[PDB]
Design a protein around this ligand. Structure first.
Ligand SMILES: C/C=C(/C)C(=O)O[C@H]1C(C)=C2[C@H]([C@@H]1OC(=O)CCCCCCC)[C@@](C)(OC(C)=O)C[C@H](OC(=O)CCC)[C@@]1(O)[C@H]2OC(=O)[C@@]1(C)O
Ligand code: NA
Ligand code: NA
Lengths: 994, 994
């Protein structure tokens, strides 16, 4: 029965066939349970440890490696030798990386929590009901509650299900519906029906929502819905149905894997089509087992050479480092992969109150009627200084200070602001400043009465904590506040019934003081106050009042206006029913206009600037506010979202206006709108959706469970640090300071990380290309392996990792935020950069193969065999091409490989420098521009020497220290790489600009 | 130059290019030093204190514990609690045991001395040489002496190197070569060359051996060898090259370690393969840190439960106790681990003189020629009573006493025995008995003349100290002993030149009296004496003499015979050269046979019995003697080594015969031989080696540096208490009384200790098996730890140690020496005993786990939770299986553990009783059969109560006094163990005999 709020208390009892005095019977309980299920959100679908592990081996590259590890293992086994001390090293290392891979994977799922599961923190363990099988109340598990049974709740209780209040046992009922919104401002409940079947939760004043808390009172009601059918349960289903896409990098990265896999296989067929000549060899001869071992040996090298093994860790380190960096600027990134997507932010949807504004309310203007005489009319406009809640400030007219007391209208004006208020002030000893207690808007009125001091009370004798509520307390003595008629979006106002203090047994004297939005409050005024006198509300004088209000609210002041009135002759107290909030407007009729107060919620001191940065960056900014359309636009013009005089007819919308548009026009409006006012519960989500239909990376702010869906959907859901635990867990980012400007600063930081990431990424994949060329060359020529798996792996994990990482600290371009948002489709490598790394690739391949093939032929301390047909053979079965002599395993010499390895290392330290900038030569962009990089290289070189001298190592990697002559040869083959790219860059700069 | 003895005095000077009058020059000294090195044995290779400590941590079990200590330490650290008062107890205790371990280890190396180092006590600090750089003699450090330089030595000097004597400055030169042999009987040196290049040291009468002492004289010689090249240095190299094997127990014990280690790891994988089900648990939930702590916690318990921590101390205590016990029977065991190997003695090689015999010589027969007439011939055989050196005794013919004086031949016979003698008698006031002075054989002759009294001298008027040498002194007046021609194995005889007393300036009258082995002495006799007359030696009469000698030496008398003769017309005194011992035989030519004396070296009064015990024990006995082959066999038949009439052709060998056999036949001969006569210097070693090639545990006796090698090699080298310091240090055992029977008695004692050791060893390892079953069970079921490290350790150190030790006093089987030597390979546990302890193991495991798991479920004062799925969980993260209630740490209750501990203690006190006998039921073998054991149990129980009540203790061990009901439960689960084994024994007795 989800329409309960609109049904009468009798109709809900009738619908479920239950008695308010006995509760459900055990038969109803069983039937209702089987029909509606248990009262709880579905349990997250289990993922076993083993199921998880298995997933950690789903990736295309981890499979290629896994396989290669198997071939490697088999090879290390089915062999012929005794140097087993380093036989299973290769397979183990490979395998270990996969293990490390899986460990991390598993470790992430253990310590990760999803927003959907955070919802269950709002469902209590127990609840209290009345079931026929007993007289007294029996508390049972909340999970066993069902639609239809009578439940009981009291202060401190966490509401167990969505309940239709049957009757309030206590004098009143106050509920804290903070988990939905964030405003712990408790709300009053009633039992009278809410007529509109489509009322939003905020107006279901006769409903209790599962997950909410009772602030005060005690009530009995009937359960309307449970489980996923409650308001919170529907929020859980919206989130559970939200499909979360991978970041642009993850998508480019996954495509690189597919392709990398598709290419590897293709090179194997290539290595085959080049040896098709073996079909022309004699049936007898050679070793069909050694050939197979050869081919299988290079697959392992191919596989290990094409995979940038250390890329996942470098990316991870950069991200973690950047994250700690963003937290320093008050931006708490929860999702590591979010830093990228953040840099691409295309549109930023921000709530106004507390994010664009400080939320520190203050009254700066207020006017009363000066005099009315026929068609003539004068008002008495004032000003107030002091933007804090502190009573420190003063009133002024024509900019000159006056005494509010000298004006009667201001005394009543101030009487209303004090009596018609549920908040106060409190001086905090610690902070040493006046803190507010209650509503920001209400405290502002409190702060106002203290600055006015209409009774010239001696407050300069009291301390800080004593003069806080001084002038108020004085006013609280002239009238006894009988009771108060709460505020309701329905009539948009609130009032307080008051009886004179020094009185007894009188039948006259009562007064009603009303406060609320100007339109309605003024429409119900039939009189206007002028000092102590009163006169019929005249059409013209009403326009005067309305015109000034329009001025303050729609002009540059962007003030929130409140109308203040008093019902001089309130209805007889007996003639009023304090239970039907529906009769409140009626009670607030025949009012007297006293005055108007305009308050300000000042824009953050940085928002003007940041909004501007966003325009410079091509990032759209959309404000979502509860202000009426008019003041909303005025605030946008003020902070710079809109230009002071530009047209915004179709760039700003209120919830209502938005709904009146058809699904096609709503979409259209979202691409152009920059101001959404008075938005419905289901709008943030629709807006993010429509924005995403134009491929825009959207950032959205919010809190409470209501915003969880939208936060989950947007690419960068953003939460306030002072927001609810659920909003946070549903967001990619948290704002420790709640400041809109933090978002901007983080998008920039995000642009800076990516640029650098794009560089270490291109640096590493680039080296894998070169590595596969060397393995392909050495196979297409039939030469002895220049490099082996263990060697490549050290380079891709250690040697090239340090530089790769250091590259993550490349200084940021100065035009960073002066360019539009990067396109998600933007590939990392393509075009001239594609051809460039192709060249570099072939260079490295050639350089590392020759470097080793050199030692064999032209080296001094080497088996000088100039063109000795290394190709022709490596069978030694003939030994004819070498008459006298007894040595063939010199091919397995470590020297030639050490020459190849050393070359790769040197070229890569060179290419690291070729990566400080995509196009700027090392002439304009100096190598020392990144000190970390230089330092990383020194460390990588020292590490290289490490494996070359510390005995266990050289034998494990199959290396041998080079002669000062051999090194010298390495530099002759390596260093030139810098020139090659310098030329290639020169070409991209002077012949590719247009 | 090690061939020096065979070279002339001129050739040695020539070989080294040195002059006898000037010595080496400083140039020769430097060259000779650099060529030959310094004159000293290499210094023992240093073992630093730190290097030692490190070795104390090489053992497999001390490493397992060391590791476990680390896990324990880490765990006690990375924890969550505040009961730190007993947090680091566990790790510290473990560590402490290792420390205690290392301390002992170090302490043993500090107070242990090796035989090789004892050799250096024989090298003097200084020596005296003549070097060209000086006229007078300069004494320098012995270490600086070298081959080639002229050295000088005088009475009291300890010979510094092996020196070839150049010339004897004193009238004669006497050297005490006792350190080589033991017979301090100084030997005479000469300078004439010894022709045989392979002469054994005993015949190098022109050599001085480094480490020997000059008894008399002064000589000059040239150094032949130094350092490890001297006779003593070669003995040092033989010993340094001897590889000493570990005892059979040490080998079984080390194998148990490997296996114990291999099993521990295997049970860890077992504890893992049983929890493979955790891969099917949800990714979220439980504590991955608590799981790890669990697994690591049981490894510590596994490690501590598998190791019999107190076994090394119990073994050590039993051995020390047994040792003090063996010393009471005159057996001084130096090596503790030797008591075992001694019990396994398979073959016992014993020297005859002083070990099988008393070495108290006495003449009991002697004959002269009665008359010779043509082919007719009669001898005059006699007998002598008195087996002491005491002059107390009498001569007799045909068993009737006569007067030696009435027979002239007996007067000369007696003249020879007195004059041709270098020994005497001395009556010891203290002992009150006649002590010998010199050679045992010679004193016997002295004692003989006193009993004969051929001159009827009045000796019954003199006291004890006065009649000792009475009859001799009388004979010493009839002849003036000019000089004496010493004995040499070469001619095997000795003589003395004598001139009449009452004479002056006569050219006739001189006489030579010869003494020696019969063959040669008789062969050089051309005449025979008959009273005072003489007649040509006739072939037949010579056979008469020879036949009787054969009879006395090869018959049951086993007498050592000496032939006595006089050269009636000795050569002119001027015609003799007293310097060339080579001309001595010639001087002793043309002799006159006077008579023969047969002396006895009586077998120890216990050897007959002990030899018999050895046959009953399957222990072979081999006699090593200097007697000729014949008398040697006769002595063996007499003491029972050989049967009176059995064949021994290939069971007895002389050194010579042995060498003539090829390496294959020598080996063969050693497995069958029981008599080695006239053995070479290198035979004891070869014999031990050949014996060990048949896997026999050999015991060998001996002394002097010559026997050190062999003593070191045999499994049980045995030294005489009256032996040299070096022989002792090279031996496993010392005989305070020199008695062969001590060896036997100690082998038996050795068999008794092992049987008992085998019992306490099986008792303790048995309990470790059961301890690992309980830890394994409790892990395979996931139950709460029934027992913890600290608890097990007290049991394996204190509780079970007392009983283990008491078991070392188990009465010995009566058939102890009625069975063959135990096989070294004999494993301690295997077969039905293996299965038996397996059962007992599973019993203890089950009993101690249930005992604790009981308290949890069926106990009255316990959290009765009958099948409460203790397995299902111990996470309390759910707390669902237990609705109402707030207590989960009741699992950490001490009660269940105290129940487990108490059970273990009781079962073990029961199993102690199951260990008095491997197969005899407690019905036939009563518990009180070992009073010490019963008493140990009472003490162990009292100690158990100790930790259960004296407050600091119960909290340290996590225990709590049991209710009279809980104890009662312990007895229900423990006591039955006695029945289980009783049944198991019953099965081994009635269904396993065959
Ligand atoms: C000490 C504690 C434990 C638990 C241990 O594993 O000892 C084994 C072991 C190493 C041996 C075994 C133990 O073997 C087992 O208990 C079999 C495996 C099942 C246990 C699994 C528990 C859930 C001994 C203890 O026991 C039984 C009962 O069978 C007997 C014997 O030990 C001896 O003879 C002692 C040598 C001085 C050895 O087989 C021995 O290995 C050898 O090489 C020997 C020859 O030594
Ligand atoms: Na999101
Ligand atoms: Na020995």
């Amino acid at each position: 029965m989800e329409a309960a709020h609109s049904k009468s208390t009798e109709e809900c009892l009738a619908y479920f066939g239950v008695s308010e005095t006995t509760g459900l019977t055990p038969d109803q309980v069983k039937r209702h349970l089987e029909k509606y299920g248990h009262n709880e959100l579905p349990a997250e679908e289990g993922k076993s440890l083993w199921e998880l592990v298995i997933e950690q081996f789903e990736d295309l590259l981890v499979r290629i490696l896994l396989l290669a590890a198997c071939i490697s293992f088999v090879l290390a086994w089915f062999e012929e030798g005794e140097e087993t001390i380093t036989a299973f090293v290769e397979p183990f290392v490979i395998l270990l990386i996969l293990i490390a891979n899986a460990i991390v994977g598993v470790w992430q799922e253990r310590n990760a929590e999803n927003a959907i599961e955070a919802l269950k923190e709002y469902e209590p363990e127990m609840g209290k009901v009345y079931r026929a099988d007993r007289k007294s109340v029996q508390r049972i598990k909340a999970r066993d509650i069902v639609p239809g049974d009578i439940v009981e709740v009291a202060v401190g209780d966490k509401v167990p299900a969505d309940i239709r209040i049957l009757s309030i046992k206590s004098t009143t009922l106050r509920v804290d519906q903070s988990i939905l919104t964030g405003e712990s401002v408790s709300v009053i409940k009633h039992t009278e029906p809410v007529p509109d079947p489509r009322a939003v939760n905020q107006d279901k004043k006769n409903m209790l929502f599962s997950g909410t808390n009772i602030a005060a009172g005690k009530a009995l009601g009937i359960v309307a819905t449970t489980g996923v059918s409650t308001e919170i349960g529907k929020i859980r289903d919206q989130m559970a149905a939200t499909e979360q896409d991978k970041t642009p990098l993850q998508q480019k990265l996954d495509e690189f894997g597919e392709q990398l896999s598709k290419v590897i296989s293709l090179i194997c067929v290539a290595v085959w089509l080049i040896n098709i000549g073996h079909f022309n060899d004699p049936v007898h001869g050679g070793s069909w087992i050694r050939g197979a071992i050869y081919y299988f040996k290079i697959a392992v090298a191919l596989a290990v050479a094409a995979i940038p093994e250390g890329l996942p860790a470098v990316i991870t380190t950069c991200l973690a480092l950047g994250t700690r960096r963003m937290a320093k600027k008050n931006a708490i990134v929860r999702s590591l992969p979010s830093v990228e997507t953040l840099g691409c932010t295309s549109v930023i949807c921000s709530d106004k109150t507390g994010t664009l504004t400080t939320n520190q309310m203050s009254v700066c203007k207020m006017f009363i009627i000066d005099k009315v005489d026929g068609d003539f009319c004068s008002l008495n406009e004032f000003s107030i200084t002091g933007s804090t809640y502190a009573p420190e400030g003063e009133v002024l007219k024509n900019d000159k200070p006056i005494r509010s007391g000298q004006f009667d209208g201001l005394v009543e004006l101030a009487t209303i602001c004090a009596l018609c208020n549920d908040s106060s002030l409190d001086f905090n000893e610690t902070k040493g400043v006046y803190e507010k207690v209650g509503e920001a808007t209400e405290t502002a009125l409190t702060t106002l009465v203290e600055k006015m001091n209409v009774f010239n009370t001696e407050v300069r004798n009291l301390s800080k904590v004593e003069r806080a509520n001084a002038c108020n307390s004085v006013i609280r003595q002239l009238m006894k506040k009988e009771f108060t008629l709460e505020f309701s979006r329905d009539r948009k106002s609130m009032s307080v019934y008051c009886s004179p203090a020094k009185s007894s047994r009188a039948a006259v004297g009562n007064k009603m003081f009303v406060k609320g939005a100007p339109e309605g409050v003024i429409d119900r005024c039939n009189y206007v106050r002028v000092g102590t006198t009163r006169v019929p509300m005249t059409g013209p004088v009403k326009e005067k009042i309305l015109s000034v209000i329009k001025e303050w609210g729609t002009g540059r002041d962007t003030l929130r206006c409140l109308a203040l009135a008093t019902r001089d002759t309130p209805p007889k107290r007996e003639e009023m029913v304090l239970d039907d909030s529906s009769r409140f407007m009626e009670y607030e009729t025949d009012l007297t206009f006293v005055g108007v107060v305009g308050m300000l919620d000042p824009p953050r001191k940085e928002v003007m600037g940041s909004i501007q940065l966003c325009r410079d960056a091509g990032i759209r900014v959309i404000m979502i506010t509860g202000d009426n359309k008019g003041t909303a636009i005025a605030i946008c013009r003020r902070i710079g979202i809109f230009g002071e005089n530009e047209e915004v007819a179709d760039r700003a919308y209120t919830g209502r206006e938005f709904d009146d548009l058809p699904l096609a026009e709503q979409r259209e409006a979202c691409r152009r709108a920059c101001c959404f006012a008075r938005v419905e519960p289901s709008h943030k989500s629709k807006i993010v959706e429509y924005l995403q239909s134009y491929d825009e990376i959207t950032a959205m702010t919010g809190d409470g469970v209501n915003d969880a869906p939208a936060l989950k959907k947007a690419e960068i859901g953003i939460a306030m640090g002072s927001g609810t635990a659920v909003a946070k867990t549903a967001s990619e980012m948290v704002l420790a300071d709640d400041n809109f400007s933090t978002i901007v600063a983080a998008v920039e930081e995000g642009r800076a990380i990516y640029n650098n990431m794009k560089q270490f990424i291109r640096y590493l994949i680039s080296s894998n290309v070169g590595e596969v060329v060397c393995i392909f060359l050495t196979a297409a020529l039939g030469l002895p392996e220049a490099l082996i798996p263990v060697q490549l792996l050290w380079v891709n994990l250690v040697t090239d990792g340090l530089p790769a990482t250091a590259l993550g600290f490349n200084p940021p371009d100065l035009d960073i935020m002066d360019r539009p948002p990067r396109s998600p489709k933007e590939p990392l490598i393509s075009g001239w950069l594609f051809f460039r790394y192709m060249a570099i690739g072939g260079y490295v391949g050639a350089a590392t193969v020759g470097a080793a093939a050199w030692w064999f032929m032209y080296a001094e301390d080497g088996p000088g065999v100039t063109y000795h047909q290394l190709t022709h053979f490596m069978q030694c079965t003939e030994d004819h091409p070498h008459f006298e002599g007894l040595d063939c395993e010199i091919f397995e010499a470590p020297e030639p490989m050490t020459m190849a390895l050393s070359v790769l290392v040197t070229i890569e330290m060179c290419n690291a420098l070729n990566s400080l900038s995509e196009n700027q030569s090392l002439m304009r962009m100096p190598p020392w521009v990144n000190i970390w990089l230089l330092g990383s290289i020194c460390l990588s070189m020292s590490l290289h020497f490490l494996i070359l001298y510390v005995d266990p190592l050289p034998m494990i990697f199959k290396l041998k220290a080079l002669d000062l002559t051999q090194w010298l040869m390495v530099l002759k083959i390596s260093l030139p790489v810098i020139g090659l790219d310098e030329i290639l860059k020169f070409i991209a700069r002077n012949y590719l600009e247009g």
